[PDB]
Design a protein around this ligand. Structure first.
Ligand SMILES: Nc1ncnc2c1ncn2[C@@H]1O[C@H](COP(=O)(O)OP(=O)(O)OP(=O)(O)O)[C@@H](O)[C@H]1O
Ligand SMILES: Nc1ncnc2c1ncn2[C@@H]1O[C@H](COP(=O)(O)OP(=O)(O)OP(=O)(O)O)[C@@H](O)[C@H]1O
Lengths: 133, 133
């Protein structure tokens, strides 16, 4: 029953490390299921959930974009921000969601849109992942 | 004069690939000059210029943070955005700088200042690096 060593790193350092059966992530190209033996690969990740499977139990992590690196003996997710499901502050993410929506409807604006949309997506992603704890 | 392979990749894909005598970058910890034989290292990068020294000649790349991944033989810069100095659209970056400055100067409510400050740093860095083409 083979496993892959996975590490999730943010600019603050490692947030998660384990040996798991499968790592599923959303790359810019599509959903990827990384199993032991996967060829080496470096792919950009979208604001999405990473799903880490170990003996049927699945651990969810909100990844606010970053990069996936797959090597023979390791899988690394390098994320601009990452939170395990159980560590997401749901109130804060709801507040963030509503703030982005308010900006996006601003009209009276020096409001930046592209970044306001990304702010909304990071909040919705965190809320979706938190539902899984 | 030993070399290290350098790769710079962004969510659009590779920006640069070559063998250089040294790569210098601004990590969260401070400036790093990476020579061949450097031990493994993952470090987050600041909004900065990467200086790639080759045959006396130096190539500059504007890097909008992301991560540095070092092995004795090869250095990967995984950037949220990166532009070789000669590829920087100066008119664009100046407009971004002035747009961010207008946003920052606004005493109006939820403009979102943190990411306005980051937008300004990115434009200033690009304008500075373009000068090094
Ligand atoms: N609601 C959440 N629960 C736990 N930590 C979070 C949450 N939202 C952001 N963080 C953390 O705060 C730091 C900044 O993250 P980021 O810049 O993506 O926040 P943001 O989308 O601007 O949200 P906010 O406006 O709520 O601060 C990162 O360390 C991140 O892991
Ligand atoms: N002035 C520049 N010249 C060439 N490409 C650039 C420049 N500014 C951003 N880009 C490119 O556009 C894409 C988005 O980059 P980024 O999100 O950092 O832009 P930005 O800071 O929002 O700037 P702008 O407001 O001008 O779009 C990245 O591919 C990047 O390489």
């Amino acid at each position: 029953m083979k496993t892959i060593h996975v590490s999730v790193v943010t600019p603050d350092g490692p947030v998660y490390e384990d040996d798991v059966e499968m790592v599923s992530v959303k790359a810019k190209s599509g959903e990827l299921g990384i199993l032991p033996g996967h060829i080496p690969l470096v792919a950009p990740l979208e604001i999405s959930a990473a799903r880490l499977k170990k003996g049927g139990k699945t651990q969810y992590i909100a990844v606010s974009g970053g990069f996936l690196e797959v090597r023979p003996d390791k899988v690394t997710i390098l994320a601009q921000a990452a939170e395990r499901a159980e560590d997401i502050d749901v109130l804060r993410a709801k507040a963030a969601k509503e703030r982005a929506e308010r900006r996006l409807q601003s009209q009276q604006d020096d409001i930046d849109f592209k970044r306001a949309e990304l702010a909304l997506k990071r909040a919705m992603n965190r809320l979706s992942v938190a539902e899984m704890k």
